[PDB]
A paper describes a structure:
The BCL-2 family proteins, which are commonly known as positive or negative regulators of apoptosis, are characterized as containing up to four conserved stretches of amino acids, known as BCL-2 homology (BH) domains. The interactions between such proapoptotic BCL-2 family members and the antiapoptotic members, such as BCL-2 and BCL-XL, are the crucial events in controlling or promoting apoptosis. These interactions are mediated by the BH3 domain of the proapoptotic members that binds to a site known as the BH3-binding groove in the antiapoptotic members. In addition to their critical roles in the regulation of apoptosis, the BCL-2 family proteins have emerged as regulators of autophagy, a catabolic process that plays crucial roles in cell survival, tumor suppression, and innate immune defense against intracellular pathogens by degrading cytoplasmic components through lysosomal pathway.
For a detailed structural comparison, we used the crystal structure of BCL-XL in complex with BAD that we have determined to 2.3 Å resolution, in which 27 residues of BAD bound to BCL-XL as an extended α-helix and all the rest of the residues were totally disordered. A sequence alignment based on the structural comparison showed that four out of five residues within proapoptotic BH3 domains that are critical for their interactions with the BH3-binding groove are conserved as Leu110, Leu114, Asp119 and Phe121 in Beclin1. The remaining residue, which is isoleucine or methionine in the BH3 domains, is substituted as Thr117 in Beclin1. These five residues occupy spatially and chemically equivalent positions at the BH3-binding groove of M11 as the corresponding residues of BAD bound to BCL-XL. Another noticeable difference from the canonical BH3 domains is that the Beclin1 α-helix has a hydrophobic patch composed of Val116, Leu120 and Ile123 that are not shielded by the BH3-binding groove, while those of other BH3 domains, including that of BAD, are distinctively amphipathic. The Beclin1 helix has a hydrophobic patch (indicated by an asterisk) on the opposite side of the BH3-binding groove, unlike the BAD helix.
Numbering used by the authors:
A (entry chain A): 2 to 29, 81 to 196
B (entry chain B): 95 to 121
Write the structure that this text describes.
């Protein structure tokens, strides 16, 4: 889905802008309610679990060379057991923190790459569960 | 997976724990 790639782009842009950066500095039933719920869910999650986002780039030894593997390792583990809306929010915040810090440490190249990995993962492994659960409208309802 | 990726593994496992608790926090 393009709406999914749009969800990723929306969320990352939000997280980036939130720290002074602009998404355009690195890239070439309604969804507005969904984008908003996710944004909020993300802020709350990052707030309640600040520790897991402190020095991610350090906590994982991330470099443009190991970035993908690290990303995939974290995510495969996160969903190893299955899927929840909670894990999905965690999935988004993680990717967001990852981008924001890549930019902070002169690795801006990772931003768009991360978005791609997220969209790909979202579409290939999360989408089925999402739909089976009623689509994103279900999250908007169940969250706040 | 090589040791260089085990940290990412533990991190993912911890992430799951925090999001399961978060999940349990919903309406």
């Amino acid at each position: 889905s393009q709406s999914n790639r749009e969800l990723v782009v929306d969320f990352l842009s939000y997280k980036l802008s939130q720290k002074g950066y602009s998404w355009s500095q690195f890239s070439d039933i309604p969804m507005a309610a969904v984008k908003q719920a996710l944004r909020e869910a993300g802020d709350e999650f990052e707030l309640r679990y600040r520790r897991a986002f402190s020095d991610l780039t350090s906590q994982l030894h991330i470099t443009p060379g190991t970035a993908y593997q690290s990303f995939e390792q974290v995510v495969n583990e996160l969903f190893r057991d299955g899927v929840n809306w909670g894990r999905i929010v965690a999935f988004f915040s993680f990717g967001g923190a990852l981008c924001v810090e890549s930019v902070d440490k002169e690795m801006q190249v990772l931003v768009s790459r991360i978005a791609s990995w997220m969209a790909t993962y979202l579409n290939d492994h999360l989408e089925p569960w999402i739909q089976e659960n009623g689509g994103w409208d279900t999250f908007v309802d169940l969250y706040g | 997976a090589p040791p260089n990726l085990w940290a990412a593994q533990r991190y993912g496992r911890e992430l799951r724990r925090m999001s399961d608790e978060f999940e349990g926090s919903f309406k």
